[PDB]
Amino acid sequence: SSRPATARKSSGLSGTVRIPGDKSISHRSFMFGGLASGETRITGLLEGEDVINTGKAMQAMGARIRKEGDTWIIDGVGNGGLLAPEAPLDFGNAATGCRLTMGLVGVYDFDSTFIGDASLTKRPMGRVLNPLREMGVQVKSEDGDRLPVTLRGPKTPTPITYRVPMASAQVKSAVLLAGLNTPGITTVIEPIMTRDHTEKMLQGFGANLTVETDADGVRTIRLEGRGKLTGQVIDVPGDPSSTAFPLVAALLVPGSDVTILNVLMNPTRTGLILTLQEMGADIEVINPRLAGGEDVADLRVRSSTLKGVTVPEDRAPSMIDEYPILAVAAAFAEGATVMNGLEELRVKESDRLSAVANGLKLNGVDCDEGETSLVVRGRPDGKGLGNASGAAVATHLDHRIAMSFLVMGLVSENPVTVDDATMIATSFPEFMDLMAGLGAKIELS
Numbered sequence: 001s002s003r004p005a006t007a008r009k010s011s012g013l014s015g016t017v018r019i020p021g022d023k024s025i026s027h028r029s030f031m032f033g034g035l036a037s038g039e040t041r042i043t044g045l046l047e048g049e050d051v052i053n054t055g056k057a058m059q060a061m062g063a064r065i066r067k068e069g070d071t072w073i074i075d076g077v078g079n080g081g082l083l084a085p086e087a088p089l090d091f092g093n094a095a096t097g098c099r100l101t102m103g104l105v106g107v108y109d110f111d112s113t114f115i116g117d118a119s120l121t122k123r124p125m126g127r128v129l130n131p132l133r134e135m136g137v138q139v140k141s142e143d144g145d146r147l148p149v150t151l152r153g154p155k156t157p158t159p160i161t162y163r164v165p166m167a168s169a170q171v172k173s174a175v176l177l178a179g180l181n182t183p184g185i186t187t188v189i190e191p192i193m194t195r196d197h198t199e200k201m202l203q204g205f206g207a208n209l210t211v212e213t214d215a216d217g218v219r220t221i222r223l224e225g226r227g228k229l230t231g232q233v234i235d236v237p238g239d240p241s242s243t244a245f246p247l248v249a250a251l252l253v254p255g256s257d258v259t260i261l262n263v264l265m266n267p268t269r270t271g272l273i274l275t276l277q278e279m280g281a282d283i284e285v286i287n288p289r290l291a292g293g294e295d296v297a298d299l300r301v302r303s304s305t306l307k308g309v310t311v312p313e314d315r316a317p318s319m320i321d322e323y324p325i326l327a328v329a330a331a332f333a334e335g336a337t338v339m340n341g342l343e344e345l346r347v348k349e350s351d352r353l354s355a356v357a358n359g360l361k362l363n364g365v366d367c368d369e370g371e372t373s374l375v376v377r378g379r380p381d382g383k384g385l386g387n388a389s390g391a392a393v394a395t396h397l398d399h400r401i402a403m404s405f406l407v408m409g410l411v412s413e414n415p416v417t418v419d420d421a422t423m424i425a426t427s428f429p430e431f432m433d434l435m436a437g438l439g440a441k442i443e444l445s
């Protein structure tokens, strides 16, 4: 069921720790490794529940996946070699696995059914199902294009040129993956850049995929379908979204000095760091280097005094999953922090804009929730913040709401309680141990 947890005011956080692997790249490592010809070897894989579910779905379609020592080894089926699954593919809490797999297997001439948990089942799939319908896929979904969904691909899919209407890397990714089993050229036009793990990894696996960027920033991504993919050696970098939690905690808890190692620094993932630096954060980027084909660095974070800033709508895609923890940082900053262009937060694991605003208010923070924006006014000394009565923040099955508010409790005058910590393991099973090791006081009921 649910397992509440309470975070208490802590003394300085201190230590050096390696952050778990990147979730986005980990999902794709299992997917591309399972699809490619031959063997793929992965080190640094995130072993959270979301990623394990993607792995099980790939096994259900013929990939052999196993862990030898600290390396995941995958024997792929080759492009065009996916086998019809016997039962529904259960993605649990993971929209990434679900949406990308819809594109990947929806274009195959067999039935595939997709199911998930109470959170995933409420999220919109129309954004990926519409382009698939244009490609010839037959779709059976629940009202509003929600799970459960059953797809059946045509004998020969139709390649399309699709302009993504919202800044979603998952929609871009689903169309490109569908293009892998479609004859001809599939083109995705992305007006605003989103995380590019699919493009970079498919090129690494040998796909004839090109990316052209116009001077105005619009990206035209072309993929030639039904081409060979070759197994690769993958070294997964640390998750910058998971890094955000100990990083913001170190900035807010006085007397802190925390170094996080091997953090992915791809600019489509670092909007929070840029934003915190503008607010006055002391974050040092150490030994920037190339590892596994990606930019990584170690980050040394020290306690800082923060000031509110205006966060523009165009930075949102580069930090979309970090708005919950940014809002918590803003609760302790001098002045107002204003964030717009947040419509996408309403369709995540939880409606994050509503969950964050309600959680902040429950914990004494002055904030204003707009249809697509949030304004937060802070109290630097944390006085009056938190909830002395022990009232619990509603997490709405969202791991990031649970983690963000637990970070808040390490700083607020009064403890912060979340109604459930059980979903944290979907993306960061190491969270409790990692934070405790740094000195955080978090009591699990």
Ligand SMILES: O=C(O)C1=C[C@@H](OP(=O)(O)O)[C@@H](O)[C@H](O)C1
Pocket: 023, 024, 025, 096, 167, 168, 169, 170, 171, 173, 195, 320, 321, 344
């Ligand atoms: O492709 C990916 O790995 C992801 C893209 C984002 O979703 P959207 O495409 O809906 O923005 C992000 O919020 C999600 O956690 C993972």
